[PDB]
Design a protein around this ligand. Structure first.
Ligand SMILES: NC(=O)c1ccc[n+]([C@@H]2O[C@H](COP(=O)([O-])OP(=O)(O)OC[C@H]3O[C@@H](n4cnc5c(N)ncnc54)[C@H](OP(=O)(O)O)[C@@H]3O)[C@@H](O)[C@H]2O)c1
Ligand SMILES: O=C(O)COc1cc(F)ccc1C(=O)NCc1cccc([N+](=O)[O-])c1
Ligand SMILES: O=C(O)COc1cc(F)ccc1C(=O)NCc1cccc([N+](=O)[O-])c1
Length: 316
C-alpha cells in the first residue's frame, strides 16, 4: 500500500505514525529515535502530553545525523483546551515549536472542541469538580488557527474529537479561509465510527484513528475491560495472515483510508508495528472486524460532560 495520503492542503501525510501520549519522558527520546531508524516519518504529539521537549531531542538528533531530511518528516501537535483564546493561540503553537525544536509543524490540531479557562492548570475545576469553561467558540478559535498558516508556523490545520455537527459548524463558518485537513478521533474495532468517518471523508477531510489498540495503558483502565489485543476473534484473523494482533489492528484503519497512530515505547514493538505494508485484509476480514463494534469509547473526561461543546452527547 502507498505510504502517504493526500490532504486538502496539497501535502502528503504518512498513513502510519508514532503516538506519544503516556510515553515517559525518560523513554520517549529513544522511542522516537528507534521509530525514525526503522522507517516512521510521522510523529503525533501534544503540549498536554508533557513530553514534547524530549520528543524534540530525538527529532533534532536524527535531523543532525542526516538520517532524514525535515521535508521527509510529518510532525503533528495540538492546541490544548486552556489556549482557545485569540491572544493565546500563537504563543501556544510557538511553545510547541520551541520544545520540538522545529520552525514549522506539518499539522496543528484543535485538540478538543471544549475551551477551558486559561491558567496554569490544564483542567481548571470548580469546587464540585466541573471543568471551568471559556466563552470562546470553535469558530473564533478556527480563525486563530488560520492565522498560523498565514504566518508560516504550520503547513496544515485540523481538528480532533469534533462530532459531525461541530465539523459542519466550521465548514459553514462565514468567511472560512482554510478547511480542516484532518479530524483525529478514537477508532478501533469496538468503536468503528462509520457515520462520522463517512461524513468527514465525504467532505475531503482525512480521518486519523487514535487509540487503535484500545489504549490498554490509559490511566483509567480496569482489569475487566474489553481487550482488543486479547480478543480471540482478532487473534484468529492475525494467525491466518501470519501477523500479530497489533499488526491486524493497525492495518485495519489503513484499509479504510484512515491514518493511524499506534503508541509504543518498546523498541521491538515499534519496529513490529511498522511491518504492515506487505499484507492485505480481505473485504470479508474488514467487514468481520467492523462487526465487533460495541460503541465502546475509552477517551473522554467526566469533568467535561456539561461543557456546552462536549462532543459525545450527539450520536456522531
Ligand atoms: N487526539 C486525542 O484526543 C488523542 C487521544 C488519545 C490518543 N491520541 C494519540 O493516539 C496515540 C495512540 O493511542 P493510545 O496511546 O491511547 O493507545 P494505543 O496506541 O491504542 O495503545 C498503546 C498501548 O499498546 C501497547 N502496544 C503497542 N504496540 C503493541 C504491540 N505490538 N503488542 C502489544 N501491545 C502493544 C503499548 O505498550 P508499550 O508502549 O509498553 O509498548 C501501550 O500500552 C496516542 O499516543 C496519542 O498520540 C490522541
Ligand atoms: O486528550 C488526549 O489526547 C488523551 O487524553 C488525555 C491526555 C492528557 F495528557 C491529559 C488528559 C487527557 C484526557 O483526559 N483526555 C480526554 C478529554 C480531554 C479534554 C476534553 C475532553 N472532553 O470530554 O471534552 C476529554
Ligand atoms: O473521566 C476521565 O477523566 C477519564 O475517563 C475515566 C476516568 C475514570 F476514573 C473512570 C472511567 C473513565 C472513562 O470511562 N472514560 C471514558 C468515557 C467514555 C464515555 C463517556 C465518558 N464520560 O465521562 O462521560 C467517559
Amino acid at each position: 500500500m502507498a505510504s502517504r495520503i493526500l490532504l486538502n492542503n496539497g501535502a502528503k501525510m504518512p498513513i502510519l505514525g508514532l503516538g506519544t501520549w503516556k510515553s515517559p519522558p525518560g523513554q520517549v527520546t529513544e522511542a522516537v529515535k528507534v521509530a525514525i531508524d526503522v522507517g516512521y516519518r510521522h510523529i503525533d504529539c501534544a503540549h498536554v502530553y508533557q513530553n514534547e521537549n524530549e520528543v524534540g531531542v530525538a527529532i533534532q538528533e536524527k535531523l543532525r545525523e542526516q538520517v532524514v531530511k525535515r521535508e521527509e518528516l510529518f510532525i503533528v501537535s495540538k492546541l490544548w483546551c486552556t489556549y482557545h483564546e485569540k491572544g493565546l493561540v500563537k504563543g501556544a503553537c510557538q511553545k510547541t515549536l520551541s520544545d520540538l525544536k522545529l520552525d514549522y509543524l506539518d499539522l496543528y490540531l484543535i485538540h478538543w472542541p471544549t475551551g477551558f479557562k486559561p491558567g496554569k492548570e490544564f483542567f481548571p475545576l470548580d469546587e464540585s469538580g466541573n471543568v471551568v469553561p471559556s466563552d470562546t467558540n470553535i469558530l473564533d478559535t478556527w480563525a486563530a488557527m488560520e492565522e498560523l498558516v498565514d504566518e508560516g508556523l504550520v503547513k496544515a490545520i485540523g481538528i480532533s474529537n469534533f462530532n459531525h455537527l461541530q465539523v459542519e459548524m466550521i465548514l459553514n463558518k462565514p468567511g472560512l479561509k482554510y478547511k480542516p485537513a484532518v479530524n483525529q478521533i478514537e477508532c478501533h474495532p469496538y468503536l468503528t465510527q462509520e457515520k462520522l468517518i463517512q461524513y468527514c471523508q465525504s467532505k475531503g477531510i482525512v480521518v486519523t484513528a487514535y487509540s487503535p489498540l484500545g489504549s490498554p495503558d490509559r490511566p483509567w483502565a480496569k482489569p475487566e475491560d474489553p481487550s482488543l489485543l486479547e480478543d480471540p476473534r482478532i487473534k484468529a484473523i492475525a494467525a491466518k495472515h501470519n501477523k500479530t494482533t497489533a499488526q491486524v489492528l493497525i492495518r485495519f484503519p489503513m484499509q479504510r483510508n484512515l491514518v493511524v497512530i499506534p503508541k509504543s515505547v518498546t523498541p521491538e514493538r515499534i519496529a513490529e508495528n511498522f511491518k504492515v505494508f506487505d499484507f492485505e485484509l480481505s473485504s470479508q476480514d474488514m467487514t468481520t472486524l467492523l462487526s465487533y463494534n460495541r460503541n465502546w469509547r475509552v477517551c473522554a473526561a467526566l469533568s467535561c460532560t456539561s461543557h456546552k461543546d462536549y462532543p459525545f452527547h450527539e450520536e456522531f
